Design a protein around this ligand. Sequence first.
Ligand SMILES: [Zn+2]
Ligand SMILES: [Zn+2]
Ligand SMILES: [Zn+2]
Ligand SMILES: [Zn+2]
Lengths: 206, 206, 206, 206
Amino acid sequence: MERNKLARQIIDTCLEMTRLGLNQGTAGNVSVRYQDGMLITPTGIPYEKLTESHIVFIDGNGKHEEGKLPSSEWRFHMAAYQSRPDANAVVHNHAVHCTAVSILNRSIPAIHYMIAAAGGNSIPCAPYATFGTRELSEHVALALKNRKATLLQHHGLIACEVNLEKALWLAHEVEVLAQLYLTTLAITDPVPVLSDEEIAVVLEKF
Amino acid sequence: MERNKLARQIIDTCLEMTRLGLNQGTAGNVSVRYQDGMLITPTGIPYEKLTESHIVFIDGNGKHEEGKLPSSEWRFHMAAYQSRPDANAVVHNHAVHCTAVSILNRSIPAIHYMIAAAGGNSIPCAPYATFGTRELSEHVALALKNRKATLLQHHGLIACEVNLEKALWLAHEVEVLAQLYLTTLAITDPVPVLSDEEIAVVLEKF
Amino acid sequence: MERNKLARQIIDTCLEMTRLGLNQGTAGNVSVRYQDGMLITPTGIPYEKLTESHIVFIDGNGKHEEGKLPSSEWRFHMAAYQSRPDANAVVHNHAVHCTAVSILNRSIPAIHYMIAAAGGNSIPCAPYATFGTRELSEHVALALKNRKATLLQHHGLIACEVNLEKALWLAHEVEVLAQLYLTTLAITDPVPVLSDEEIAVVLEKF
Amino acid sequence: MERNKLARQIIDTCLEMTRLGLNQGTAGNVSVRYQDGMLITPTGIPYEKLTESHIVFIDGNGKHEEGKLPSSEWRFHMAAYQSRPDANAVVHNHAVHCTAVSILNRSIPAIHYMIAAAGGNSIPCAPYATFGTRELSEHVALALKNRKATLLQHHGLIACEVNLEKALWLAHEVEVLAQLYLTTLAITDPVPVLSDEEIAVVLEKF
Ligand SMILES: [Zn+2]
Ligand SMILES: [Zn+2]
Ligand SMILES: [Zn+2]
Ligand SMILES: [Zn+2]
């Protein structure tokens, strides 16, 4: 639980995220809770040139280390740490099926029982607001109140969890749910869903 | 035919299954017939951390080794060993095209002559029932009576065979059949199919 | 131009074909012209266990080496060598977009100027006939008369060329044309095409 | 900034472009500004056999080095260097989602805020004209006047930038935008877009 073990996993998550096809168009941002703020990936540097010493600490006041530019999307990683106190790692990306679904501006309903992993009977879509703005943050903060993952209209996904390992696993899971919904949406609308009861038992079980 | 040669192939099948894009969202479960029960992958451990000594033996009575948690989906691997006496390895996964087809709750008809590999003129979809429950098992058991692979509504696929090598090969084959049906379903419905006669000769031939 | 240089490239083509996503569900068959017959991949053996000494010579009379089983699909590799005298290597596969298009039983029209690589303004679909039968051969033989690649109804693709390098390149090219046609077919039908004149100049040019 | 550092990156871009799934059917062409002309990939040679000494210098007069054939598509890399004076590297490819969109002959509108990377509220499609012709060049030259990437009807994509690193990054970005538009187009038409105002702020911001 040293700074650099934390900055290495963040890097490992980038590379691994890219491995899975989650980060295409080198746009993801990864962060973890630390001290009174967080560590996040820097802006600019492509993921393959990232060393532990690129990772930027941002304190709880919004000030970032000297001579380092945090991701341009950092403000909403801060929103999720204050909206979800149990959240300890945060993953963001423009994964394609997620984003297609966010362009349609729809929530993904309970088409498959793994929707439960994000906490309920859906994956919501928060409305559009320019990137890096405080209003973008307000949407995300209210979206993540009862869910661990959220789509972002005309933009992409955010997934939060107790460590990067599970944060990643959820992000990825939601990408699969996303693809499944688009692929069936092209055949029939609406798509058959599982009742709220049924999701209730899966959540009890989970 | 030692315990560990069996637990290694199970692992090799996981990794290889993941290689092909069959296991996405680390959800597959693999098992083989053994003694009076089976060996299966454990629950929790991601596939890349699996050693031979993680694999859990479950006896024919339903009791699993001490201090090891079998997959949460083990009950229906047991159903397939008792429904199909010739089945010696079992593969399960939430492969995406299979699952999309299982969300539509349709059977995949004879759109291509390789449907014969699973034993007949289709790949059925058994109805939904909560995971890990005995009622889930009853559906799978009656589904696999005349077929070696079956979809599972709002859930995924199960494929059984004489060893893991062919169990895997079928699983994979069905994923391709799945994709083919969705891709053509988006253009025209119904999708052109091959007569029952025609499937009869392919089965004779096969 | 020894037997084994020829059997190695056949293997290299299998592995490479699998690399590109052309051979999924280990179904492709590869062959090259040799002496008075050809060399072809054997039936059964998965591609990763193939050594040069697995490759089976089939003479012009239809008799195959002693103690070796040629692909089950060999008869139509022989049809293409007698239908196209300039053909020296032959590639076959159940590539998914090609096959989806062959399930719709449509020819792929001049949607993109690379259709010219196969010799004209389309990639035809020959009608269905059971695999391995002489009637399957008659369809393929008349299909390849004026084209170097052909789809096969409810089955897959065949592509022929002066060596394996170009045979492969065409096979692959046709897979891309296939995907392009399906992807646009789901939006609008018919798909915009390039006039016959226009294809004429591309062929002059090519 | 030697000739060979420039010819190596061109090669690295080919291989890397192929890595991402941008160059399928070995059709891409890459070039960089040099002296009074450019360096470009040669025609024929597959990308895996390219050494630095294959790369052909073409002067500003249209004459190419002795005993070397430039890409057949070189004329329009020259058009982009004279249409966009700030352009220093050029990437071209028949990437599949881009091309499907170019077969529909539509421009990709502001479905996602990254459309701004190419300079405005869209990615245009220039009309069809035979490859390698001066009229093909006139279309591309007027297309790239206010945009850094353009689709080409029934053909593919062109993306230009200050070096190969960003030229590639844009090409790739546009492929993702392309896929997103097709995937949502199959569900609903028109696809929801972001106002011109909204794109204006993203461009200010960017
Ligand atoms: Zn973003
Ligand atoms: Zn399952
Ligand atoms: Zn075949
Ligand atoms: Zn081109």
